[PDB]
Amino acid sequence: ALLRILKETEFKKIKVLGSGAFGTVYKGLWIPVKIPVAIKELRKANKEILDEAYVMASVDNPHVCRLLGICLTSTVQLITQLMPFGCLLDYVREHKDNIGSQYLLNWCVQIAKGMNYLEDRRLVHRDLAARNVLVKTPQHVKITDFGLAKLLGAEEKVPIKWMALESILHRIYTHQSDVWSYGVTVWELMTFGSKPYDGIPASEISSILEKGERLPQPPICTIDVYMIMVKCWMIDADSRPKFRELIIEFSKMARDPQRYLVIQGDERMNFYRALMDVVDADEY
């Protein structure tokens, strides 16, 4: 079965990872052999959920997290493979001094590949952000949490600072609005985890965007890279780069990293063991 319906006794929530926007995520073990997993519990009609869930379990790309199972008790619990290194936002914030140009550019490539794959599956993420990119290994990141937004009425009567103008104003979500969010995610990485429009009230975001104001150029960014970001935030959705084009361009830059990102001491660059702690779901 592509989407395994797990019994409430097959898995167990041990520790709390964090409070998401759609529910609380726990760290746990899935005993079909104990498989380390992340379990998200959301805040019958479960057929729509099971249908939307199926899509989440049928994705097969190395840069996209896949849902492994679901438990429909009093609440809905989503089970997926645990990514021991946590989310990319916290990762860059914590290694702000040992992250080189090579790693940053490759993460941009990987995220673009994962998004292009979702685009091929006609799946709009609706909530791409560095917090929703997980680290399998420092050299391997993956996108997660796609689809949840829609499953909970995102485009029905909110991460405003990551949303495309048209999404804010008209609840219009497309692969091109995801490109906008990709632009912001890239900005979060290049600034080592800064908060976008920090201080600025969410209620005023649409206003400044219409005025042509945009997030500032990250210090390590050459104008070559910043331009890509700005293009992702053009009002005309169809004018924004396509994920296919972003893969090609960041891949180009990944071949000569120090030419596009200026990081002092680049050439020379807690630990999730005692943090997270059995066969890896990947091996299983």
Ligand SMILES: Nc1ncnc(Nc2ccc3c(cnn3Cc3cccc(F)c3)c2)c1CNN1CCCCC1
């Ligand atoms: N370290 C991790 N390893 C694995 N998943 C994680 N989160 C996570 C994200 C989305 C999730 C689940 C379970 N269902 N869905 C929905 C879904 C949708 C699409 C594909 C798909 F596969 C899943 C779990 C974390 C994050 N832990 N962070 C650490 C920092 C504080 C906040 C919590």
